[PDB]
Every structure is written in C-alpha cells, then in structure tokens.
Amino acid sequence: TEIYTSVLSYRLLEGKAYSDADTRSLDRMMRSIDEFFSANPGYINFHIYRSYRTDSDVIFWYSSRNPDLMILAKERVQASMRPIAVSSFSSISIYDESPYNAMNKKLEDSLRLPPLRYFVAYPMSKTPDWYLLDFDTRKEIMHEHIKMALNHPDEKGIRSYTTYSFGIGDQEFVVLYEIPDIAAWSRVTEKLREARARKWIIKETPILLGRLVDAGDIAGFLL
Amino acid sequence: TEIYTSVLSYRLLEGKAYSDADTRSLDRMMRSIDEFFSANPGYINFHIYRSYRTDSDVIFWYSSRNPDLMILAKERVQASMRPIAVSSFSSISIYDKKLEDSLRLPPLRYFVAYPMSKTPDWYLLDFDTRKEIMHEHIKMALNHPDEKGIRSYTTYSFGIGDQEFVVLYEIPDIAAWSRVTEKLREARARKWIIKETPILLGRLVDAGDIAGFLL
Amino acid sequence: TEIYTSVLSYRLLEGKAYSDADTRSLDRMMRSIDEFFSANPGYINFHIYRSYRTDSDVIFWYSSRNPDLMILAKERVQASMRPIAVSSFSSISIYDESPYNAMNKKLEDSLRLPPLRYFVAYPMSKTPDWYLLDFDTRKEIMHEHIKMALNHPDEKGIRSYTTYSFGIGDQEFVVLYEIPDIAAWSRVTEKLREARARKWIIKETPILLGRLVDAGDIAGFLL
Amino acid sequence: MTEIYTSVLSYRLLEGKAYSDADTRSLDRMMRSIDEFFSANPGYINFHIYRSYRTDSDVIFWYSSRNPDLMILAKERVQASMRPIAVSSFSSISIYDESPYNKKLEDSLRLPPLRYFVAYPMSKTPDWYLLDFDTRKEIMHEHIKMALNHPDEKGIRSYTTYSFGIGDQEFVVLYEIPDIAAWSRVTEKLREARARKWIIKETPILLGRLVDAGDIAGFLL
Amino acid sequence: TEIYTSVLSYRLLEGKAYSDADTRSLDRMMRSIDEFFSANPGYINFHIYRSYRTDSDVIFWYSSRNPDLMILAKERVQASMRPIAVSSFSSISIYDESPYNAMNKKLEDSLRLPPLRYFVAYPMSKTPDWYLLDFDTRKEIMHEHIKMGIRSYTTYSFGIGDQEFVVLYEIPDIAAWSRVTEKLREARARKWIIKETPILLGRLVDAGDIAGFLL
Secondary structure, eight states: OOOEEEEEEEEEOSSOOOOHHHHHHHHHHHHHHHHHHHHOTTEEEEEEEEESSTTOSEEEEEEESOHHHHHHHHHHHHHHHTTTEEEEEEEEEEEOOHHHHTTTOOHHHHHTSOOOSEEEEEEEEEOHHHHHSOHHHHHHHHHHHHHHHHHOGGGTTOEEEEEEOTTTSSSSEEEEEEESOHHHHHHHHHHHTTSGGGGGEEOOOOOEEEEEEOTTTHHHHHO | OOOEEEEEEEEEOSSOOOOHHHHHHHHHHHHHHHHHHHTOTTOSEEEEEEESSTTOSEEEEEEESOHHHHHHHHHHHHHHHTTTEEEEEEEEEEEOOOHHHHHTSOOOSEEEEEEEEEOHHHHHSOHHHHHHHHHHHHHHHHTOTTOTTOEEEEEEOTTTSSSSEEEEEEESOHHHHHHHHHHHTTSGGGGGEEEOSOOEEEEEEOTTTHHHHHO | OOOEEEEEEEEEOSSOOOOHHHHHHHHHHHHHHHHHHHHOTTEEEEEEEEESSTTOSEEEEEEESOHHHHHHHHHHHHHHHTTTEEEEEEEEEEEOOHHHHHTTOOHHHHHTSOOOSEEEEEEEEEOHHHHHSOHHHHHHHHHHHHHHHHTOGGGTTOEEEEEEOTTTSSSSEEEEEEESOHHHHHHHHHHHTTSGGGGGEEOOOSOEEEEEEOTTTHHHHHO | OOOOEEEEEEEEEOSSOOOOHHHHHHHHHHHHHHHHHHHHOTTEEEEEEEEESSTTOSEEEEEEESOHHHHHHHHHHHHHHHTTTEEEEEEEEEEEOOTTTOOOHHHHHHSOOOSEEEEEEEEEOHHHHHSOHHHHHHHHHHHHHHHHTOGGGTTOEEEEEEOTTTSSSSEEEEEEESOHHHHHHHHHHHTTSGGGGGEEOOOOOEEEEEEOTTTHHHHHO | OOOEEEEEEEEEOSSOOOOHHHHHHHHHHHHHHHHHHHHOTTEEEEEEEEESSTTOSEEEEEEESOHHHHHHHHHHHHHHHTTTEEEEEEEEEEEOOHHHHHTTOOHHHHHTSOOOSEEEEEEEEEOHHHHTSOHHHHHHHHHHHHHOOOEEEEEEOTTTSSSSEEEEEEESOHHHHHHHHHHHTTSGGGGGEEOOOOOEEEEEEOHHHHHHHHO
16 A cells, blocks of 8 residues: 655766767667656656756656565666666655645645656654654644745645655655745745754755656757 | 674676676576575575665675684675675674574565664663663564564674674565654664664565576 | 856866877867857856865856756766766855845846956855744844954955755755955954854865866866 | 884775686785785784675785884785785774783784784774873773673783874774674673763774685685 | 965775886876976975875875965876876865964974974864854963974865864874874863864875885
C-alpha cells in the first residue's frame, strides 16, 4: 500500500570532448530510460530535470508501491549513466499521505498530474529533542507551520510532498516540491523561517533545484 | 568465543562501457567470491545485496569467529573488486536461539547496516540505569505492530573502527521497518544516540544473478 | 520583477600538458562564452575572474531577470568547461533590492557600472533564533552592522549585494562584493566582527576571491 | 636520550587496473626494497608493515627514529615507491611520551612486534587544558587505574605520542595488541572513565595485522 | 602599505611511474619557479619546503605588498604544477605588523632574514563570542598569551578566505616547538580558538634539490 520514491542526480564526467556521435548516443540513452519507466504500470511517475547546480547535470524523480521496482529502476538508471557520468545524490523514502488524506485528496492523483516547471528536493532531519516532546506540543508547533504556509500569497500552485526515510537513509525526511516560480517559492521558504518548527530542523543539504525537461530534449540542453 | 562481522560496499567505476565479455567476467568473479566463502565453513555467513544508494552497487556481509579469516576475506573481496570498483564503506565489529544459529538461518529479503555511536555522558550512567533504558527501547520495538519478522544484531567496534556500534538488520518490509524506527525516536535511549553515516539499505541477491542486475 | 544571479567556479583538470593548440582552444572557448552573454541583453551582467584559491582557476558571475536564461547560462558554461575542467562551486540566488531602494537607488543600475578589480563571494546563513527575533530587533542589529561598515576608513568604493537563496540552495544568502582593495576589505570585515549581528551568522565557506579579467586575456594568465 | 619521533602511513592500491603476475612480482620487489631501506639504517629504531582491516587502506607502515631528518627521508622514500601504484590514505608525525615506561620505551620498540596494531589520532577539548593540573592528574589517574585493572589489558603495549603544533591532531595513540576483541572490550570499559568527557576526534582508527615485507604481495594481489 | 602572503601545497599525481626524463623535467620546473620569484623584487620572500604529510609533496611560501603579483604568483605555480600535481591547500592573508611595530622592528626585515630549517602554517579562527568581548578584556587575555630562535607571524584573512587567521612560524626544532605549543594550551586565549586544520609542517629545501628528494 505505501508509495516509495527516489530522487537521483548525476553529473557527466569531465575531461572528455563530446562528438556529435556522443550527443546522439546520450539522446538515445535518455529516451530509452524514459521508455523503461513508461513501459511498467508499476511506476506511478517518472520525471527528468535539468539542474541549476553545477554538481549535477540531470535529476531523476520516480515513484512506485513496489520496492522491487524501486531497486530495478535505480540499477537501470545507474547502468545507463555509469559509462558517462557519476551520481551526485540519491535518496529512497516513503510518502507521508496523511496531509493529502486530511484534505480528501489522493497523493497518487497528485503524482499523476502533469508536472510543474520546477522541482525542489532536499533531505531534512530534526534534533533528537523534537521526538521527545509530547505528541500534543509537536502537533501545535506543526499546526503553526502548516497554517503559516497555507496563508502565504506566494504559496499558490505549489505541490508539496513529505516523505520519510527513518532507518533507511542518511536523513529522516526527504521533502519534495513541484513549483511554478523559483522566486515565489524562495519567498515562501523565507517567511517560514518565522515558524517555531525551525528551532528543531537541521541538515537541509543538498537542496536540488530542477527545471522540467523531456527525455528527447535533454542531450541538446546538456551538450 | 567471539564472532566478528564485516560489511563492505563497492561502487563500479564510471567512465567505462561494459561489453558482453565484461558481463560474463563479472558473473564469474561474483560466483568466485561466493565460492571463496562457501569453501571455508569458518565463514558462519556470507550474503550479497544490491544497493539502493547510488554510491554503491553491491554490499557484502560475512561473519567468522576467526580474525585471520576476517582479514583474508577483506583482502579477497578487495583483490577481486579493485580492477573494476572502489570501496565506499567498510566495518569490522564484534557481535554483542543462539546468535550463531540465527546467522545460519536463510536471509531475509532486505538488509540495513549502519554505524552508530553514543555521547560520552551515556557510558558514565550507572549500568542498571543503562540496562533499564535499553530494555524500554527493546520493549517499545517488540510492541510495535510493524516489528514482526525483523532480525537485529547489535555489534560493537570500540577502539577498532570509526563508530562504536554497527547495528545490522534483516527485514521483510522496508516501509514497516521505517515506521518502527520512527516510533523508536520516542525512546529515552535516543537522547544519547549519535546517528552516524552511512545507512546502507540492500536487497538480497544470489551471486549468479548480480551481473544481470548491475549491467 | 526579481533579479537572479549565479556564481560558478571551475578548476582546470590536472595531469595534462597544454599545447599551444590547447592554449588557443581555451582562449577561443572563453571568448565564445563571453559573446554568448554579450549577445543577449537579457543578461544584465557577466564578469570573469582569476581565482586566488588553488581549488579554482576561474570564477564566473552573471545576472538576469529570466530564470530560463539562468539555466541556459549554467548549461552553456558547464558544456564549455567540462572537456577541460570541473566545477568547484555554484550558487543560484535572488538580489535583495531594498537596501538600494532605502537609499533611493536602483540595483540594476549598479550591476551595469564598470566592474571593480576584485570580487568576493561566499555563502552565509543565520541561526534559527535570528528569524524568530522581532522585525524591529533585526532592523536595529542590521542598522548597527550597516553603519559600522559605512563609517570604516577602509570601506571606500566597496559595492555589496545581499542575495537570498532560501529553499533553493545549500545556504540562505550569497553575499557578493566588488572591492577596489583586498586588504582594505579584510580590515573592514575584521571590524565588523564586533557587530552584534555576528552572534547569529554561520557557514561563510567557501569564500571566493577573484581578480577581474577580460575573456580574451584569461588563457594567457592561466597557461 | 633525545626525543623519539614516529610516523604511521597508510596506502591504498589504485583501482581500475588488473594486476598481472609481473605487477605482483614488482610489488614484492618494491616492498622488500622498502624493508631493506629501513633495516640498513640503524637510525630507524623500528619499522613494521601491516595488512589493513579497512578497505580504504591496503597497507599500513609504522616507523620510529630520534632523527627528524630520517623521518622526512622515510616518508619521501615510501611515497616515491608507492605513488606509481597507490595513494596515501593517512599520515602522521608525532613524538613518544616516554613517562609511562620510565623500563625504556626504546626497548619496547625493539621487541618483536605483536600480531595486531591499532593507531588513531586523538584530541581534547580546549576546556581540558584549562582545568587545574591537579584535576587533570586525578582524571588521568582514574583512566590509567581502570585500564590496569581490566583482565583483557594483558599483554597490550601502549604508546601515547604527541603532535601539538605539528599535525592535525594533538595525540596519536598506538597499540600493539595480541587480540582484537580483547582490545575492543578494554576500550569499551574505558568509556566509563571521566577522561572521555573531553576526548574528541578519534578517526580514522587504523587496525592492522602484522606482515612480513616478502609476504604482503601474496596477501594483497 | 600592507604585506600579503600565501602558502600553497601540492601533491604529485599518483598512478605514474616517473622516468629519468620526468625527474629532470621536475628539476627544471622547480628551478624555473625559483627563478621567477628571484627575478622580481616585488616578492619580499619565496621559500620551498618538503612536507611531512603525505597529502603534500611540496609547500610554497611567498609574500608581496602587491595583490596583482600575488595572483600572478599563484597562477605561475599552479600552471607549472598542473600537468603533474594537484593543490592540497592554499591560503591568502595579510601580515599583522603590530607585534613587530611594538618592539620597534620591521616585519619586512624579518621576512628577508635567511629562513630557518622548519616552517609551520595553519588556519585558525575564533568563536563569535570572542570579538564581542570588551576591547579591554581581549587585550588582557592576549597579553597573557603573548607573554606566555622561533620566528612568529600572525596573518589575517577576514572576509577573503575560509579562516580568520593563518599563523606562520619558522622554527629550528620540531620537538621543542611541539612542547611550546602544548604549554600554550594553558593560555586563557585557547577558550575561543577553533579550526586549526590542516597544520602544515615543512622542511626547507633549495629548488635545485627538491626533485632528488621527491623522486
């Protein structure tokens, strides 16, 4: 029943000049990755992003209820990327659907919508003291944050996903956002620095910022 | 009487395309490592895992009472892997239904390894106090509806590695284990626990199947 | 409305002697990058710097209102550098225009002034406690800081830009400075260690220090 | 009677190349040649080679001399021999604290080495040095007594060395040990000493298995 | 009239067997770097050092009042080193001439003295809390430390590097120096001192001799 997700980033190896043949080879490879995901109904979503950071050229995001499909997908992407690139980040985590369920929405339905132009992903953790607080006081601290986010004008049109990775990765959470406007998102985040929740929040690096790209267009953008 | 254990992870080197002959060579090499371990009953266990993390392609886990076998194993695996791969992690530690019998059971589908340490203040607490704290934590785990079927081994590495403990888990269900872990954040024991890196998550694989998965 | 900015740094790969041909190639490539930025009026500024740090050989700094131009610029620079170099830093952030508005002046005008000889950039963040202080408390603390800078004997000629990157990079701010004199700036910074503001400031690494260079002159300096 | 310096260096064979039998013979010749280099100069008090339990090293070297010129010459020789095939994963230079032996520490260094070796850097918090000398003395005496009284301390040879101002750590502590698990149990017990409150930065911990120069190529390749 | 200084360290690339041709080439290149510095009186000093640390083979130290000569020197060294080596550290900082001015001496005169056998450099910073102490309190604490052969240089790099200070020493004896540093751990000043890494320790070498030592 639970939905797993991964975010992977890769950087093309330096020290090599790329021929036209190399460009075409990259294009065929990205199209093939895209076809791998489209061919299996078990993949709920798969999107590719160009990267604003120089430590990555491409970011991949995909989701499935099947943990076997999750490892197969990682190996597929890795096998395709390794002759020309190295991974700069990976995460595996599980969507928390409760914010969607609370609003009579299905998280999966959101994942099936055509993606927004930008994507933000980062790991996040909280200090040990956070979990040692009463469920009630944590609820209050979190309500303030949620209320504050909901009330921001620049919040309009953002799709937010909280995912958990306790016991299975180097962070407790991986938080994912589909966003229409980089500056607007930054302003929302800046306002949310005003929430008490911040006092317990740590380790939000790397923050990945991506620009949606079709598989057939990426080689042309990169090379 | 002590039983040692090691977890090693490796990443295949980038920048090279693998031919069909390279794929066969990898298959032979992986099967050769597997048979290295099976040929010596001194190795209580040996398992290979596919890696969820992109910083590794394979994880190895093996155990022996014989510290000589532990260094021979590390050298064997490294000698086999170095032409095509680099290690991304290693640990050597000592384990804390006999544990040996448990290690001989058929392995579960998933595996988690991670280093961990505790704050200096922890060890300065009374043994009875620490025992009580550790028992609440065990009890909290045992009572969680998602804990069913998880096997855990706490191993120690004081003075012999870069963490104080390496805790190893065989788990049937990744999401279930993550939920148990989340609940355990509420245990008193967590106050003194220093998360260390990396947390490794693996999918059990037969040596004969790994070249097909990787390449 | 918002103006975006990026600072990128690259290190030439080691282990190869550069021929005369390789020198010509680097000169041509740098000239071509520069023509890329000059040809598009959508790029408000673009400057190249030689690097005092050994972990870089070149620093690029450019600005645009257009985030599409920003991702295209990053991809263009990365595609040009990757056969011979690896990136050692990148940032994407948004100018804060209010300090300029407070002195009745436009930030864009300033970005159009002839560049000064030296350049400093670094990331910076603040402790969670900072954002939880009242808005008027932060104004008082920041006033002390800004005034202390303005009255320093060594402050002459310095142009500073505070840029923000909440939710879009690994730091909260990227602070950029054009300076006429390195030691003068260092003395100003040393005095500002006495400002109350320092209590809440963290993570000022890496600090990049650059010497202004024209695209057609850098090959000569690097090789 | 002047100070005795020591260095621990570790190296990892470069990945991405298959080693031929000729490569194996070359490594054997090189290791034997390094061992001869240390043996030929009586200024080197000891020199031992260790196989490494960690994957980030294949070999660990330990050597000592009163002559700091011989120390840098040793590091340069080892690096020159290793660099065509390996990268260094750790190095240290430090000076033995002879007070616990004061027996002669040099006599201990000249004994045949034990089967295992542990080395690691260590530092203390700034606050430690600011404590009254009596308080530091009382804390160190507690630690030493707790170590002396542990059954598993049997037959371990310990060396504390200092590197204030000359390296990235304050101390490099070195142990010759007969048994890995016994050492780990001693170390575990010693977490109960108050000394621990001020100790930081004990990474990497290097754990080695003694090896003859003529046997290492066979073990590694 | 400030004086800038840089410390650069480099490590020869591994994976290459150096021929005799390569040794001669290294020798020519080192002598050529030395000739570059000697030929320009704008450089107040320039010295090369062998390194105790395996992460460096060579350390360079030079000084100039002219910041455009400083970037020229770094690029010159980097251009020569690039085909065979990678830099493991660099700093750029400015001498604090006040201790020399307090004793009515000139820092520059001291930089022109024949160098001592050993060189120590490391970055250092202080906690924020330090600078916010009353000017009075700071001067008192510093007087205990200052009061508590060796040639010392404090250099500052506020706002221009990853550390606040780079402290440089020419020393005649390593062990004696380690003992001085241990004693100074007792100075009140240490409360607020952080981040002294890497500590580089160098042995003075002539340009003409370095190739023979390294290869």
